[model samples]
Target: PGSEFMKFQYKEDHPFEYRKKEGEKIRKKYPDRVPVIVEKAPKARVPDLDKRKYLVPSDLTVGQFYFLIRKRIHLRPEDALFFFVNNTIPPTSATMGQLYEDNHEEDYFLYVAYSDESVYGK
Candidate 1:
């Protein structure tokens, strides 16, 4: 549905002003949902998300959120996807609400980075 987002790199394409304007509009209209931006880590072999912006429930756990992404790509049980916020890995126990509050950028939305474990090798 959002094919254009595939060509767009969240970090490079959306500047602060654009993010700020977009976030504020959504925040005002949808108070119950948290606005989030998730992008694949550079050179990561993971599949691309069909959509760019995700408006998720605040109460959803990080674990649940990660699994949702897994479902999107139909990843096998043997594979693992690494999740990051602010380049730091977060515990599954944290809620999306907590993540939004703690790590939301100046743009006022939680930004997420995801990748397959294969991105790193010893």
Candidate 2:
């Protein structure tokens, strides 16, 4: 079965691993650049948003990533978008690479969630 969003719980026992030797080499070469998966939050009002992969750079801060997300989803400047990992704490000003390294799993995909708010209310 296919899913638009496959959630994964981030636990200390879970770790990242490169499936192929080539992939590991590439990762080492460009340690700052990592693959990431962005999942639109369940409560997101935007229907056009979907899960996708992004090559995130270490220099890109969370604030910058926020703007990129806004543009990707065609959201206005005033629109509120929240990003988080493990369905909990949001990534503050951490670099994209920093977030990716901490969350990525065996698939080498960084899991991120975006939403507009439905429960706690933004």
Candidate 3:
């Protein structure tokens, strides 16, 4: 799952290579895939946006899904891919201080999974 030419951006030459390999490894790594899937995303509800205890959506722009997969999820562009997402709300003008509910209901997070095999070729 390691490659020298990794395209982090969408316009890059290759995409979707590692998705397949990740599935393969995940299946091999966890045959049952029951509890392990939970580890991927883990949260269904949004968390408090205190910045101290929250990881806000890394990118809220269009076609930036990969950013979440790459930057926020901490997965290489070509890594095993999966996701656990909380019920995210549209980000408001509120700064970290304005949103202080400190409850999952108040915010959400996204977990995307991928592997190096997904992008080995380009």
Candidate 4:
């Protein structure tokens, strides 16, 4: 199925007031980057935008090691980057850097995947 933008309803008054308008803020901060779809992962059934909150694509397929690139043509095999304030908690290791936005989850890192057309040939 294709991805369609939608909203998640956490319990109303949920301490974490997820800003619905933060999408533009996220885009402004991280220009030229967009989320990539992970095919065949368990959460592949989910829409692209919805999968961010789920696990990152560490491996191309199940039962395979995370770094096994031969399994498939995946991108950014090292880490998953995501929109900080527009989404969830930041990574504890500070893989990307200081959190651009505040008041979201404290441990959840935004999952990210990207590609460079130059990497693959026509």
Candidate 5:
């Protein structure tokens, strides 16, 4: 039988296997954590904390980064945090790599501007 297309099937239920492989690839691609410089907006309500840089995984999501920022600043769940980049709009569910690609400083650091405002209509 002359067949140009070779039929192939997975040896097992590779449901979770795919994820592991993807994770491995991601880790390989981004072996180092990205540096983030946090700054409070001029109109920010809260008192400015010590200026510090944060190291975050490149695969981190914007939502996860927001939560991590809250945790770092000791913000309660009831508190609201607003984060923005070069633009006033908030970052999407974009990964840290994407953010870096779009907003990396000449010094190779990512700037994250944040404020405590009524982000949610409560």
Candidate 6:
């Protein structure tokens, strides 16, 4: 629940070899899928996710992914939720593969941040 100087707990818990080998092993097998790490934002008021990692289809739209999140997290209509990549929220019309190709780590995993907190105000 923080910033750049910080990162997902998975990064710390799993380490480089875990992610590298996990991605390497997964990619050749599930070539159509992209590995992703979804983390809640620092100030988010949402409940903890059921899990933090995902292997999403390349063609999956951001909106579709959100639907999956709502199913797992039980997100409500009255609550606000936003998915961010590269420090800003992406368009729901975009595809995961498009996002992955544009924004990925050395380990070949995309990092995603979800937040219910409003980004602007004051």
lDDT of 5 by residue, 22-113 (tens): 44554456566666666665545654446445667878998898877777775556766787666343566889878876875454556676
Which residue ranges in model 2 land beyond 4 Å of their true spot?
A: 1-29, 49-51, 118-122
Q: Give the per-residue lDDT digits (tens) of candidate 4, residues 64-86.
A: 31232212443344544222123
Worst 10 residues of 2 by lDDT: 2-11
Question: What's model 4's TM-score?
Answer: 0.20
lDDT of 1: 0.76
Q: What lDDT score is found at residue 113 in candidate 2?
A: 71
> Which has the better TM-score: candidate 1, or candidate 5?
1
- Which is the better candidate, 1 or 5, if ranked by lDDT? 1
Clash count (model 2, backbone only): 1
lDDT of 2 by residue, 57-96 (tens): 8779878887777788867777776776655544567887
- What are the per-model numbers of colliding residue pairs? 0, 1, 19, 4, 0, 0
Residue ranges of candidate 1 with Cα displaced over 4 Å: 1-8, 118-122
Evaluate residue 63 in candidate 4 and report its C-alpha lDDT on the 0 to 100 scale: 21
Colliding residue pairs in candidate 5: none
How large is the C-alpha RMSD of every model relative to the true structure? 6.5, 6.9, 17.3, 13.4, 18.8, 3.0
Which candidate should be chosen as best, given TM-score against the real structure?
A: 6
- Residues 14-87, model 6: lDDT tens digits: 88888989888878899999999988777677887888989999999999998888667857789887777777
Give candidate 5 regions above 4 Å deviation: 1-31, 47-51, 118-122
Give the candidate order by descending TM-score.
Answer: 6, 1, 2, 5, 3, 4
Model 3, span 4-97: residue lDDT tens: 3322222132234543344345435644331111122222222221221223332233124334334644333445442222223213343222
Q: Write the per-residue lDDT of candidate 1 for residues 1-122, one digit (tens) a residue.
A: 21112222665777879989988888788887789987776656677788868998888999999889778865678777887786677779999989998988788888887777423210
lDDT per model, in order?
0.76, 0.63, 0.29, 0.29, 0.59, 0.80
Weakest 10 consecutive residues of candidate 4 by summed lDDT: 113-122
